Design a protein around this ligand. Structure first.
Ligand SMILES: *C(=O)[C@@H]([C@@H]1NC(C(=O)O)=C(S[C@H]2CN[C@@H](C(=O)N(C)C)C2)[C@@H]1C)[C@@H](C)O
Length: 238
């Protein structure tokens, strides 16, 4: 797998991003803008993985609790229904995890400094610190986080991590499995899109990734998966 084809996938999408990969504590960089791997961006919709872990661990919820939609007009129309913590993970429904963050509370949430995620600061507003700061995390710190979650090595209960892991399955073909969570901080300039997860190769081998790239409103949501899937195809991970 050349480190140069990576460039022309990103050259052709007219973007500026990096694809971090980790295979058992050996990290390789892959992008047309490799410097972004050590650059702090807001975590956006990816924080839902740590929000679910902190909630399920502290028993502020469970994998079964159904969240009632109480009428208000939400961003996308697929969010306007009752759903559980898992279905809200797939749809990235923000209002659900906000109510969970209020159950946890700012004091208990500021667990974040114990896990050592990003700059480890959440400010005062407990329901929008991952969307416009003051929380920022580097794509290297992200790929290390999901690497521990896949190997079931995060500082939480073993049953809690495996529950969050089951909420993150995206594609299961050819004995492979690809877990991950998407993000898109559309409210900051320049915009930034995420796609952090891992690959469960058929032999159980684990390869974690953390795709970071600048976003624009005109891009499709399937521009992140398209860019990643053709890169794991090239690196012979799938
Ligand atoms: C998390 O970034 C937001 C949540 N996640 C998310 C995504 O990354 O897919 C969408 S934003 C993105 C999805 N399509 C675009 C759109 O608004 N439509 C075409 C409907 C933008 C979603 C908002 C969380 C902060 O809401």
């Amino acid at each position: 797998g050349h480190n140069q084809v990576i460039h022309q996938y990103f050259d052709e999408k007219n973007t500026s991003g990096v694809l971090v990969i980790q295979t058992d504590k050996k990290i390789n960089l892959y992008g047309n803008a490799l410097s972004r791997a050590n650059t702090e961006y807001v975590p956006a919709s990816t924080f839902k993985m740590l929000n679910a872990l902190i909630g399920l661990e502290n028993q502020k919820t469970d994998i079964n609790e159904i969240f009632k939609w109480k009428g208000e007009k939400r961003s996308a129309t697929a969010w306007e229904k009752d759903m559980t913590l898992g279905e809200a993970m797939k749809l990235s429904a923000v209002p659900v995890y906000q109510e969970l963050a209020r159950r946890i509370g700012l004091d208990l949430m500021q667990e974040v400094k114990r896990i050592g995620f990003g700059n480890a600061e959440i400010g005062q507003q407990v329901d929008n610190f991952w969307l416009v700061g003051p929380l920022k995390v580097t794509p290297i710190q992200e790929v290390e986080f999901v690497s521990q979650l896949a190997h079931t090595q995060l500082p939480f209960s073993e049953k809690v991590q495996a529950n969050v892991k089951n909420m993150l399955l995206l594609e299961e073909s050819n004995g492979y499995k690809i877990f991950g969570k998407t993000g898109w901080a559309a409210d900051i300039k320049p915009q930034v899109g995420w796609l952090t997860g891992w690959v469960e190769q058929p032999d159980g081998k684990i390869v974690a990734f953390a795709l970071n790239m600048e976003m624009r409103s005109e891009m499709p949501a399937s521009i992140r998966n398209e860019l990643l899937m053709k890169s794991l195809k090239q690196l012979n991970i799938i």
